Amino acid sequence: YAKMPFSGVMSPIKTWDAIIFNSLKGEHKVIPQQGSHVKQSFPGAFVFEPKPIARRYIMSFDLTSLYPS
Amino acid sequence: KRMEDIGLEALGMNDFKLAYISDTYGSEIVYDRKFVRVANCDIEVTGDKFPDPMKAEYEIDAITHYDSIDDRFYVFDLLNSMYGSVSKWDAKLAAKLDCEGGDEVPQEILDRVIYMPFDNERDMLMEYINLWEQKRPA
Amino acid sequence: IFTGWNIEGFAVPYIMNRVKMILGERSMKRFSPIGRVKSKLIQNMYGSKEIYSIDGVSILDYLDLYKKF
DNA sequence: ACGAATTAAGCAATTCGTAATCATGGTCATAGCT
DNA sequence: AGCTATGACCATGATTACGAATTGC
Numbered sequence: 001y002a003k004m005p006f007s008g009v010m011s012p013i014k015t016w017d018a019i020i021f022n023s024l025k026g027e028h029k030v031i032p033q034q035g036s037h038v039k040q041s042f043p044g045a046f047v048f049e050p051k052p053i054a055r056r057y058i059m060s061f062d063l064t065s066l067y068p069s
Numbered sequence: 070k071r072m073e074d075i076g077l078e079a080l081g082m083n084d085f086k087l088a089y090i091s092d093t094y095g096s097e098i099v100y101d102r103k104f105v106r107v108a109n110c111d112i113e114v115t116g117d118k119f120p121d122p123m124k125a126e127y128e129i130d131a132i133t134h135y136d137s138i139d140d141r142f143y144v145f146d147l148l149n150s151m152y153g154s155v156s157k158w159d160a161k162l163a164a165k166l167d168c169e170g171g172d173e174v175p176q177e178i179l180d181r182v183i184y185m186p187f188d189n190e191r192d193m194l195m196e197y198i199n200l201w202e203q204k205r206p207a
Numbered sequence: 208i209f210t211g212w213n214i215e216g217f218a219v220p221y222i223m224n225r226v227k228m229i230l231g232e233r234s235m236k237r238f239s240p241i242g243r244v245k246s247k248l249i250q251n252m253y254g255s256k257e258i259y260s261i262d263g264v265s266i267l268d269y270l271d272l273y274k275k276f
Numbered sequence: 277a278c279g280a281a282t283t284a285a286g287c288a289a290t291t292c293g294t295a296a297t298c299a300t301g302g303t304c305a306t307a308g309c310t
Numbered sequence: 311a312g313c314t315a316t317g318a319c320c321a322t323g324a325t326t327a328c329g330a331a332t333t334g335c
């Protein structure tokens with residue numbers, strides 16, 4: 001699907017790079033050069049503080065695939 | 070390298086494999102599982118202690134290799150070794166029940182098994198190399 | 208020679224990053240006489256020291272210069 | 277703290293064990309009174 | 311000769327910081 005060698009599937013970086021490059025080339029565009037950055041830590045997801053007591057009736061909700069949305 | 074030394078961005082794929090892949094096909098790919106040669110292998114070595122792949126000082130005693138295009142198992146057995154010389158392996162006994170001395174191996178799997186015993190490790194390894202050349206797994 | 212107090216700790220990393228993320232990479236390299244600036248990450252003393260190297264000018268941070276001399 | 281050539285999904289969270297350190301109960305030893 | 315108040319100890323209990331193994335969105 002990504003028009004990539006078989007082993008590259010073990011690294012999502014390569015498959016996403018290949019598929020985005022294919023999409024860009026299909027519209028006659030050009031990808032930028034691999035630059036250089038530094039590893040940093042950024043805040044992650046959020047989780048509340050539950051009160052460790054028995055809760056009789058609970059409703060549950062979720063958002064389908066939060067981050068791509 | 071020269072553009073990096075000057076300091077201007079060089080745009081495009083730095084890896085040419087998928088670049089040639091895209092230039093070759095361009096359109097979507099239609100594939101087929103039965104046309105791709107997928108192979109599995111398993112190794113058993115008999116020795117006094119745990120054999121080390123970094124050294125491989127012990128002989129190889131049991132070779133098994135499954136191929137998908139021919140859906141065939143190849144089994145290599147060494148009759149004699151410095152750790153013990155033994156007789157051949159019979160498919161029929163393997164399909165028998167454990168109480169009757171069998172090994173409970175299913176008969177349908179046995180239908181796809183091809184046996185080649187060899188006396189020494191060198192001949193077995195030569196045969197494995199030549200079959201690998203004949204049957205190159207994808 | 209481009210010097211100052213704790214210049215390699217704040218001034219340079221800050222100027223470089225602000226120019227990169229406000230003007231772009233091409234403007235950031237204009238500082239280098241030969242347009243060649245690089246960023247390394249050093250994980251010593253709780254890390255976070257993005258020492259910037261500008262090719263053509265010498266970074267001679269005064270804090271360590273006074274520390275060792 | 278200059279090695280210098282280079283490379284491959286992320287973060288938040290609990291729980292346990294270990295090593296360090298301070299407070300202390302059960303019990304033993306001292307002893308003192310009867 | 312024995313009960314009992316108290317110091318030492320020996321281990322026991324408790325709290326903190328850090329490494330590690332494992333989920334789960």
Ligand SMILES: Cc1cn([C@H]2CC[C@@H](COP(=O)(O)OP(=O)(O)OP(=O)(O)O)O2)c(=O)[nH]c1=O
Nearest residue numbers: 045061062063064065066067068069286334335
């Ligand atoms: C599992 C997983 C999830 N995430 C992120 C991605 C967004 C959210 C929830 O999306 P998930 O795929 O869990 O939700 P999904 O199961 O797809 O949605 P439903 O709960 O089934 O509706 O968490 C991640 O970064 N890495 C992971 O390994």
